[PDB]
Symmetry: C5
């Protein structure tokens, strides 16, 4: 089997609209790497950031034997199921800056790392101090509760040319629940502690 | 039945372009806005930029399945379902949907759609910097379906603490509009956001 | 016949790319703007940003069905229908459609499309801050269909009370343009919005 | 044959991705508006009708007993890959993306375009005015595949612009690149304009 | 064989989603930027807006045809062929392609793609209003294909009407690797040394 055969197989087997549960939730790993802080407004409490959203999960149906073939291919995400992640305090659409390609590994692991520019409503107070501001970004599945999707977290790539610098990034698991229903929604709370240089 | 079987059944039965009227009764659409943010307010132009969750529910009993030994809910892309053609009458920008365009379908045939929307409105911003605050009225209804086809029924907890504004009161009242040409009435929800600068 | 049957039949007979000329008659397109808002006015650059409902009606008799014992109207996405290729000649932005892109089809074959449009125009903004106000003229017609293929016919109630501007008068007059090349005439409606800044 | 039959036939015969061979493409700009001029950055924002004609004989039909012209979406036709070499924004097509096809196989496409250009704005606030040169040609087809031929410059120009047109000149030209022997044909449109 | 036949054959054999690796060799992608214009420079935010031609070439031997008695080159929409998934690592906007999205395919299987791109970068703008000027570094490589799948090789048209002038452009090969994995990603580092015209 050559690359074309693996890709043909993935396209004919992929169910983009069907969460690939093995009765277990799909374990989605999410890690933000901050690349840039572009605009900060201490009056409106708004930030414009660029981050790589490292996103991994498993779809065992996509797996193939790679003893005598490539163990990884690039696949357009429009061909694959993708977690329906959203940032709860986003105030703009995520602008994906990068090619919308995922990597599929022969064991069925899927890796997606879009570079995203997005605006958030978060605490910008203290940005011009030594201690800096702490902007909290909550990312979770919009429509899949904890029995369907679990979200697990895990300044190296931050631009030296930003007016801001990063003091600390903290990535903590959290859970939200609504008055209506017993369903809990898992999220990652990403705490970006940063300040003006 | 697994998730794929429920979704294939929904795909084969759902007619995205056909309102699911039972007999000649209207489809009862529930609409509830939850305000998340007030981003830009202009007291001179009377324009406000808001973020809200538009909780939208209705019934398509043709989609129903037995969930005794199966999942009782799935996520479905809205392009596979009929969705109410709701619009805000006093919007001055396109709705920016911030969230994945998936609905939930429940085994009893309930459909639930909760987009997070950023949109700009023309409304009364006068008094925003006072104690009594401003009252901004948002009218949401079906653009093309009169009251015999769609009825719209209404029903601070999630408001960002980091907004420059705070919410005093949200009221959701049912209302109805009619045009000189025709006897048809269009139902809407009038959402009254009473808010002020902190 | 139920709504699904009417919609199936419309999709089978509708030719979105084919003007529905009955005999070899022009398709009579009715156009009526209802101004909802005036957002930005620049008296120096002579530019206005407006919101209007473009009430647009025409006949496609091939879509007709018997509506004794069926619904006499349905909502249909405009991507399933032929739609007039109307353009504003002094527009300087693309029309931003604010509303769902659904038309109403009546069982006699009448089609009604009422998009809410935000668009920017180049027009006369002089006098906006006076009592007599400015008169901004918007020219709307078919871009590619001359008068033997499309005729365009015209016909403050919904204006936002919260605008900084107020409407004194709207006039809708039929007009016709012809180009040096060809004998073909293009019909338009000239919509004259007389408005001013409030006291 | 009725309109539906002409359009059905165009869908069966048209190859949007195949140049209908050089194809002689006629290009003529009519300036409608000058919106923004910046003397410091040498940038202009203009609105123009790009009158574009060519022949695709494969589209032809007998019109003795049918319409001799139809409107066709450009996504159904081959269209010249014309670009402005000194554009600094994407062309914003303001108008419905329909061409006219004549029964002899002539195609006419007249988009109204808003676009920003890098060009000489020096003298704009003088009596002699500025001369802004806009170079339009095929991006990927050299002169053996596409030839570009030009055709009252102020007849359609908005009276409400802060600017006025003194002269529009449309001259044939050619570009060639260090790599290759191929020549690319262009029209150089010289817009002589000034502040009122 | 006429143009229609060549294009039909390209559509029948081209796999837009499949990198055309020959044996187990990487696809050699040649990338060369020609700067056309510098539009907006912000010395406070360290942001530039530039227009450049991204000359992109590679080989897809599956596309090849006999051109002894037919055209040796055609224009093909990029949606009909595989295209390298190049991205600028310090881009802060989507690339805005200003030009028709057509590649040239040569009968030997050579593919040439030259989009005119407007894009905003985060890079060092300090010194732009000095004699030595600013050096803005743009890193371009494959987003998803490591060095065993794609290799990136580097290899006059600047508007005379820009308020900036170009002192030097240097194009150097480089390689990145991530803590997770052994895979290396090739890039080109393009160094644009430029400054404001007309300083005293
Ligand atoms: C090539 C590249 C440029 C920038 C960021 N990348 C990354 O961050 C990672 C990465 C991912 C994880 Cl889960 C952990 C770590 Cl430590 C690194 C990575 O593999 N790649 C290549 C890829 C691009 N798209 C996909 Cl899918 S994989 C890059
Ligand atoms: C996960 C999440 C984030 C934000 C808002 N949501 C909500 O408001 C509700 C919700 C809906 C109703 Cl009708 C009543 C109540 Cl009390 C709550 C909800 O279920 N969910 C998940 C969903 C997202 N899209 C669909 Cl469809 S369901 C969330
Ligand atoms: C519900 C609604 C909100 C706003 C404007 N509308 C209108 O102006 C008219 C209308 C149309 C005409 Cl031809 C004459 C008159 Cl007097 C009124 C109308 O019927 N509707 C509903 C519709 C929306 N889209 C279509 Cl198609 S019909 C509304
Ligand atoms: C109706 C209209 C509004 C604006 C500009 N138009 C034009 O300039 C010309 C035109 C074209 C040429 Cl080649 C020479 C001359 Cl002298 C005039 C024209 O025929 N039309 C209609 C058309 C629009 N799109 C197509 Cl295709 S044909 C108009
Ligand atoms: C016509 C044109 C306008 C602008 C730029 N172009 C170029 O830069 C080059 C070019 C390419 C290389 Cl690899 C080296 C050199 Cl030295 C020049 C070129 O051939 N062409 C035509 C083409 C445009 N798109 C394709 Cl595909 S071929 C132009």
């Amino acid at each position: 089997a050559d690359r074309a055969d693996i890709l043909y197989n993935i396209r004919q087997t992929s169910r983009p609209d069907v969460i690939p549960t093995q009765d277990r939730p799909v374990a989605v790993s999410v890690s933000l790497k901050f690349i840039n802080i572009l605009e900060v407004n201490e009056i409106t409490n708004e930030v414009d950031v660029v981050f790589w959203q490292r996103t991994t999960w498993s779809d065992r149906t996509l797996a193939w034997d790679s003893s005598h073939s490539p163990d990884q291919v690039s696949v357009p995400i429009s061909s694959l199921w993708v977690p329906d992640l959203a940032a709860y305090n986003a105030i703009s659409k995520p602008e994906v800056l990068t090619p919308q390609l995922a990597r599929v590994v022969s064991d069925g692991e899927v890796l997606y790392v879009p570079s995203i520019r997005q605006r958030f409503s978060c605490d910008v107070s203290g940005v011009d101090t030594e201690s800096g501001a702490t902007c909290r970004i909550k990312i979770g599945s919009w429509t899949h509760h904890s029995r369907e999707i679990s979200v697990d977290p895990t300044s190296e790539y931050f631009s030296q040319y930003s007016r801001f610098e990063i003091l600390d990034v903290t990535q903590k698991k959290n859970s939200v629940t609504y008055s209506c229903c017993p369903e809990a929604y898992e999220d990652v709370e990403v705490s970006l502690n940063f300040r003006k240089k």
